[PDB]
């Protein structure tokens, strides 16, 4: 949950993030696959 607002602009979060004074793009959650593996074809977004 990297904020696109001032101050708290980062954090691999675990709940709802409260940046009041943050826009719609003023936050940005990235739903990352930290649970199971995928057969790493480069047509899938691999380990960058």
């Amino acid at each position: 949950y990297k904020c696109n607002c001032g101050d708290s602009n980062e954090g691999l979060t675990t709940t709802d993030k409260v940046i009041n004074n943050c826009k719609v793009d003023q936050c940005h959650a990235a739903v990352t696959n930290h649970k199971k593996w995928q057969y790493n074809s480069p047509l899938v977004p691999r380990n960058a």
Partner: antibody
Amino acid sequence: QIQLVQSGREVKNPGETVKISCKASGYTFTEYPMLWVKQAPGKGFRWMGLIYTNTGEPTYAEEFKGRFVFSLEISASTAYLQINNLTNEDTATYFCVRDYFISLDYWGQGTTLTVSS
Amino acid sequence: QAVVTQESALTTSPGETVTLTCRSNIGAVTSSNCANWVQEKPDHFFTGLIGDTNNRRSGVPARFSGSLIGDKAALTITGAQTEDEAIYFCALWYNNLWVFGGGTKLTVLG
């Protein structure tokens, strides 16, 4: 708190255009979540959109874009909900709604706009 | 459109718990649905007595509560007075704005 310094009486003609400004305090214009809003003559708050702080500028409603034009004087700590080029039946108040304090947590001061030259 | 069969009617005495028990034309808005019973004041003064659907809003009297009441918008404004003439608007928060309804402008006993 996030409170818009409201517009003046935008007395334009039918087709005349004037801004209902919302000098957004609580943040900057790039820090104050202005919801554009037309406090309509009949019903009340007809939304010109919501815009959270880090942008600030209210992204428009369903019918809330068009004649009411959302813009942001972000370095001037405000937006402009411009009652622009409207017909005669759009005399309404230009207001903001402070998108922090989970609804519009403050209100813009409003401005009475009327189409008559 | 976020205008249900709202709390449009409130005529009470000073200190009365002003209940905008608005029967929602769609249903109960949530805390993420942001069913806030704000005070849209006279002279177009948008303010929150209860905002975000489970929290009392800032800048209002302390007895305000904006939530779900009935099956719709529920304003429990504790301490509603005669000088408290304003609009109990129990409305929603769409997650991209807060949408105040028609509301009920009221004056009280006092």
